[PDB]
Amino acid sequence: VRPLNCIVAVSQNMGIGKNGDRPWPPLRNEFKYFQRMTTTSSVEGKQNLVIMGRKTWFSIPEKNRPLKDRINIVLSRELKEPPRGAHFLAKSLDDALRLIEQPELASKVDMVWIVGGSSVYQEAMNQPGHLRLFVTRIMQEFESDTFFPEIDLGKYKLLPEYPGVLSEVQEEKGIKYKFEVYEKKD
Ligand SMILES: NC(=O)C1=CN([C@@H]2O[C@H](COP(=O)(O)OP(=O)(O)OC[C@H]3O[C@@H](n4cnc5c(N)ncnc54)[C@H](OP(=O)(O)O)[C@@H]3O)[C@@H](O)[C@H]2O)C=CC1
Ligand SMILES: CN(Cc1cnc2nc(N)nc(N)c2n1)c1ccc(C(=O)N[C@@H](CCC(=O)O)C(=O)O)cc1
Hints:
It is built from five helices and nine strands; from the N terminus they run βαβαββααβαββββ. By secondary structure, it is of the alpha/beta class. It has one domain: 3-Layer(aba) Sandwich (Dihydrofolate Reductase, subunit A). Strands 1, 2, 3, 4, 5, 6, 7, 8 and 9 form a nine-stranded mixed sheet that branches. It is globular and about 45 Å long. The site of NADPH dihydro-nicotinamide-adenine-dinucleotide phosphate has 26 residues, from strand 1, helix 2 and helix 5.
């Protein structure tokens, strides 16, 4: 509820998403890792929190909305009322970060995950605090619309190992990828 965790899947050419969906073909095993990672809280009773941009919200299949067992906060400057399924709606990453720290919430939130938006990722990283990046490395080049900020290895450190995460190369539908975890604390 204090450290922030970004979770993204990026291609070799640091690309994410392409025209509404992801540039690469659907990787079912990568969704499982995404599901398990953002869904598993470390405490019984308390749930995980996921924050995402509005385009990301409507990208999730309607029947998989809201992401189950997780508190879903949608960010939007245009919407004035939370979209069906949305627990909370926030005007900005601060409105959201200050809401999450309210006594009323903190009592029921364990981990907070930023899961969607090149813009949200960017503003999440552009600010002090214990921050962690869970990156799924798609070992292949794809053409992408939107992208992901470069990782200053002078600011973040690669965790040799992290609990609950496996580090061996994975492969599905002929596409290779591996899980990585970076950390920053300032
Ligand atoms: N595989 C992966 O790792 C991921 C891929 N993607 C893909 O990326 C695409 C979405 O990219 P992107 O264009 O960045 O969309 P996002 O949904 O992340 O951001 C777009 C919208 O999010 C809201 N928003 C973003 N930042 C803020 C902020 N700081 N404060 C308030 N509101 C904010 C906006 O509200 P408003 O509209 O009202 O202005 C904005 O128009 C999709 O095609 C998706 O499938 C997304 C996440 C992960
Ligand atoms: C569009 N999109 C955004 C998306 C996709 N892959 C990512 N992968 C990673 N690693 N990180 C992200 N932030 C990420 N974001 C989606 C789309 C669908 C579902 C979804 O329905 N997820 C179900 C998973 C259904 C399943 O695939 O088992 C869940 O309960 O988490 C999630 C995110």
